[PDB]
Curated annotation (Swiss-Prot), chains A, B:
This is Superoxide dismutase [Fe]. It holds the Pfam family Sod_Fe_N. The modification N6-acetyllysine is found at K50. It comes from the Bacteria. Destroys superoxide anion radicals which are normally produced within the cells and which are toxic to biological systems. It catalyses: 2 superoxide + 2 H(+) = H2O2 + O2. The keyword Acetylation applies. Homodimer.
Amino acid sequence: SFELPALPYAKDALAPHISAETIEYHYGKHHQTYVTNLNNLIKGTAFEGKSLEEIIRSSEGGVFNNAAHVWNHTFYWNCLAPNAGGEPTGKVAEAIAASFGSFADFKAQFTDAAIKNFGSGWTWLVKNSDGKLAIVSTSNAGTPLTTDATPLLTVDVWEHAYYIDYRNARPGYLEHFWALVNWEFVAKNLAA
Amino acid sequence: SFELPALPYAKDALAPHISAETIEYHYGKHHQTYVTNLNNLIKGTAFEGKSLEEIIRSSEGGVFNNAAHVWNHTFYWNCLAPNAGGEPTGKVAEAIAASFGSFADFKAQFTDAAIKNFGSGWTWLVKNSDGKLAIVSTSNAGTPLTTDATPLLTVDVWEHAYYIDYRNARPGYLEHFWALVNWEFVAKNLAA
Ligand SMILES: [Fe+3]
Ligand SMILES: [Fe+3]
């Protein structure tokens, strides 16, 4: 039985970038529901004893949608943090500069892809199997886990992720997303 | 040059089922933006001068997404109305009963499909080339116009259509949607 991992911080820790109200709905209702959905769908199936990643790589339809959504959201919450954001340093900074030229270029490209992601979806910074970094976007519950690329950072662009706080202004949401990036988590993802 | 058609009723005419704030954003900002996006994208091209339908039936990428979105939204605004909703009578009532057995059955199935539509999309009631009615759903900006089916009724299930008024409660949104259905429009679409 899967459970909703506890948020990594206080419900109001991401304010004003992401409100406590958005956390209440996005984490407390949406994410929670995906967990319940998954448990319901895999009950009595061969998926029961499998890890989240394992189910994501061997399922389709509702099972896949909910499994991928549970994983994507948990990853998303860890990509955010209070007293973070800004420009990265250390290994992450070097890696980003090596693949995109500079952080500024990376940022613009990431923001552009996230804003251009049509409909519901996710935009990611990944580390390809060849060690190089790249920006890719997925639709709906899609995830880089079904490929050989390693997710390092993500932004949820389903409208529920920002409508309470930004309405249709996805660009404003992205702007504030940058002020919340947990580069420590990104570094851990990169060094793994 | 395409323009945003005027709303068929006052901004607060659909309340409390759909708020004036939702119209302010959904119609005033979202819809308006697809219109501008479309004009910018086709200026100086062979699409300039064509009708929405013609562009929708001969484009792809951003031109299609916006042309389809403009058409879909104007159609949606016409599917709603104050002092309407309820159960239909006349031609629409007969057609629905003939294809679904009873309005009750139709209503349940249309609602189910709309709630199941994963991600952003639209759920429609259409009349196939054989004259029979059917319920079909499209993703993102997809529309029945790219098929041989004739759209009769539609419900927008992109989260921006209901998040302000219902947050994650799409079922509640659908409940109130029925209270707004403009059967006069549906009848006009059916008899065309
Ligand atoms: Fe989400
Ligand atoms: Fe819409």
